[PDB]
Design a protein around this ligand. Sequence first.
Ligand SMILES: *[C@H]1O[C@@H](CO)[C@H](O)[C@H]1O
Ligand SMILES: *[C@H]1O[C@@H](CO)[C@H](O)[C@H]1O
Lengths: 497, 497, 167
Amino acid sequence: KATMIIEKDFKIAEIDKRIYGSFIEHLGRAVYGGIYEPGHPQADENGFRQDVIELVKELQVPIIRYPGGNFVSGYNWEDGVGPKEQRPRRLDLAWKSVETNEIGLNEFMDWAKMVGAEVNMAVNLGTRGIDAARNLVEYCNHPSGSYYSDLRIAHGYKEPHKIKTWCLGNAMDGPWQIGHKTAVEYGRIACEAAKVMKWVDPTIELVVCGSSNRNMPTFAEWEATVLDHTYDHVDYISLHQYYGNRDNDTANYLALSLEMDDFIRSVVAIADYVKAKKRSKKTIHLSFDEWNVWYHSNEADKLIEPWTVAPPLLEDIYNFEDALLVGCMLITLMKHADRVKIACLAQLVNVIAPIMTEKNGPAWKQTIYYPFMHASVYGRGVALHPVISSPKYDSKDFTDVPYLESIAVYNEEKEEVTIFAVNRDMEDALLLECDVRSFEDYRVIEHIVLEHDNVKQTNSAQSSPVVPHRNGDAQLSDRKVSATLPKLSWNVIRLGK
Amino acid sequence: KATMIIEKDFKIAEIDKRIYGSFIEHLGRAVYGGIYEPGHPQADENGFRQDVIELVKELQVPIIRYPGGNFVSGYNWEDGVGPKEQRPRRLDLAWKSVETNEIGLNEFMDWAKMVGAEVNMAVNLGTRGIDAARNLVEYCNHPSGSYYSDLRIAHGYKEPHKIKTWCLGNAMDGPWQIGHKTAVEYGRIACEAAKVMKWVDPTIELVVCGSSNRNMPTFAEWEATVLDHTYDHVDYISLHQYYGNRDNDTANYLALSLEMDDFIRSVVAIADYVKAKKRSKKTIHLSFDEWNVWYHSNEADKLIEPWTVAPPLLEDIYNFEDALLVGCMLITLMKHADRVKIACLAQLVNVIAPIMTEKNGPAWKQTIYYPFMHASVYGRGVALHPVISSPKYDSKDFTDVPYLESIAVYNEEKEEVTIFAVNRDMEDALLLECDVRSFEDYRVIEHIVLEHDNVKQTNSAQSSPVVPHRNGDAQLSDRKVSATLPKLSWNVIRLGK
Amino acid sequence: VGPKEQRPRRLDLAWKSVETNEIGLNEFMDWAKMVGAEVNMAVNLGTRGIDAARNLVEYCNHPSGSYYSDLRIAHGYKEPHKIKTWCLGNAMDGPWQIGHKTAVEYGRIACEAAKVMKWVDPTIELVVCGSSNRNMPTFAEWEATVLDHTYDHVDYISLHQYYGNRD
Ligand SMILES: *[C@H]1O[C@@H](CO)[C@H](O)[C@H]1O
Ligand SMILES: *[C@H]1O[C@@H](CO)[C@H](O)[C@H]1O
């Protein structure tokens, strides 16, 4: 048995819909053969895959980070704009590919508009710096009457793109990054970039790069230093996290969101430390601008030859347990709606992706597609504080892991309450009881469940054995939702009226 | 009108009783004329005033920091032990007084035993260092069989004092401190002291010094550096805060507890930053080991001549508004019961104190005595998460100041719920309604009120216009407590069964 | 040193033992004479420093005519021990050492100790401490910094290694 109190007045915060963002890099088949495939029978007039467009629209992704990622740290934005015959072929040193620049930022904006997403644009602070940062912002955002704004118009884009939210580089804390910088070097260049970008267009927001990963030897130290350098000029700091089940330990794998919860709290604490050191009245929030499962494809990648166009990199095929873990991360992001304002599922298409495509073939939904869709579609509203009493278990790296991972989100305007919940129990159902006196005249609309008996089962172009059903047994009597959560299930219990 | 949900399952944490601690320094008449006055009509056989002893027991202070404070940073502990004839007279540079050392550590422990309080002993890291630190821990804590343990025995204390919780110096971030140290310098010596101390006795816990003040130019930077140097060897970091109403603005003055809230949150975030930076599993908590109102006596102290014995320093005479703020500070401590585990009202007797004495005369209770007693006696148990909805106001330095400052503390063993509440409103009563559905069969026991028309009214040896009364109108009906909180009142609503 | 009655019992924090001090430096030299070995005497730079370092070199090596040399004589050792080779502390790069010091801190105090020691007796030679262990996170960095601080005043740097067959 597990209990929960769903009280309307115990609120975490309004959820920023941008926690349901995603990310496309110039990496592998994410662009070329992903969003864009001129050959394809389902391609539109500009070469965009309509099938992929529809699949992204159904996710309701409000914001997509572009164009990187490790890619941007060696990229010249001018190489992807203007007449295609003048666009150079470049060696992408990030992923050891030849980049044709057949797609550049203006074509990507056109695509984003098709899927109804705004673009979280990144500037190169690896091989480039402040001049290119300001010039890119002018090119994108200044209406007209200057060289770069008039350039965008000459390139066929009369109206400014008016990009709101920019990333100051990609994580350059690692020795594998193009133009790696120590935290003082980065904080200094980010500061000066942030300044000029904001002087070109003061309506923008800036995300400074956190650590590329929580295991980095400079983790936490990085963020503190970077923020100490940038605090007054920026709006968010980012964090990044990928998970994997490399030692076949399902119970331990599903517990990993407890680490994510702590990682978030840590980065929040750094921001609040620096806030206090500067005596600033401004609070800096988090952009969790890379998160996913990523591991399945590590060995296949090692054999890709350098200097191909659009190599099949990072193409993980997700299973059912991966979907439960993604569900637990989504609940974790919602749990921190007060401080996490942007997040990006890395990445959106082909590359560690909820959507996979085949050349001249179908686009299909991975297992992780479902819990992401559910969170994005039914998780707009106010994240409520979970007061859970749940049984617990110990695993290799965690103790007191709840079997129940859960949160409710109340949308006042639709008059709905959705309860997201994962049963981590590998053997037994969990009987959830939720106390909803705070909500008068509500009923159960439906109870959706994603469950499969085999945690390693994948989806594919030809069959999808791992798909939600609507036969969850949740019922509401005398101010209490009772619901059976099957073992290893993701559950979406929706309430209305 | 204000509301409040008193929900038993929404808990902050168990309250550590040491948040009701205090502090006595070799300062002013805190010791000589305070705890200790030979030939006072109420002096016991060791010279300790019995009236003072009863007043402290009534407060139920569990722990008392000693002997400093700024005094410890220039103090040799050996000067206050052994036969009085061999104890030298010293220039105390901290308070420009002659310290005869007629009281030292063994006599203080004798007094501490009388009031039922453990002692939070501080070691000098101003003029002294790691050798003195180990020798004092040995002298106090090691049974026998070494020079310093046998020395204690010989001085007449056969059993070890067995002091649990030590302070690694006093705050030395200030230019006014004896033996001021930079955060690096202090961090390194605190680190090496903590080590040899814990090697003498691994049962101890250590408090590293935070900033002497939130307004210090090195605030926050200090804590992060100090913790970077000491994390693995220490258990708590301290914070210090005093408040004053020098511009006669009551509305702003009562809101100062919102600042203490932010300060606690800041220091917690710094501890959690350094934890993450070190990848430690240990959480560091806070010792709020100086807090109080302090300002009334600033001008009188300027006229005191250097190099007297036991000059009448820091002898603030508190008023009623001062008690309301102290009440707000106490509620703020409870609100942070999850991370603030020790706290020390600075100071206990004569010196910025809830208890005042006169030579050969009476001992009396300042206004601030009452909210502290109420908080200590009735605030044992679990602090519950306040879910309040209060009207609010703006002052000089704060926005959206709740008229209602309140928290409930649940004592499951006594089956009681205590609601502490201040109404900061200077004109209007506040009608509090408390939802108490999760406490079935609970009744109002009593409603204590401390109120006075004149905020500037003080108590004195001769009369106490400012005392609690029990004419509060709190009543249970239909699972809800309704209570009228008068303008500018401290209220304790006690429920049970 | 001196009459056993006035020698105190101490908590040795290194090995968590009570050290009665029934043996100290003059008795050890007595034993060293029996086995025909000279003594490589180490000075405390953990809890102590340059004043103790000079006073111990004087006590051991200066003939007579000063407080510490006459004190040795009075303790019953008329001729100086004439110790040639001293250790400037013990390895303090470790978090487990009493009075751990960073390479800079150790370097600076070793430097000033080496000076006053050699001024008492220029015939001595000094060993500055290297890393307590090859696996220390500050290995090599430590030695370079320590030597940068002490090169001109010292003669040797130490190294320490233990082996085991635990697998
Ligand atoms: C996070 O990992 C890769 C793929 O998502 C990006 O290049 C990066 O910064
Ligand atoms: C805090 O303020 C004074 C008096 O309480 C002490 O000496 C100190 O460290």
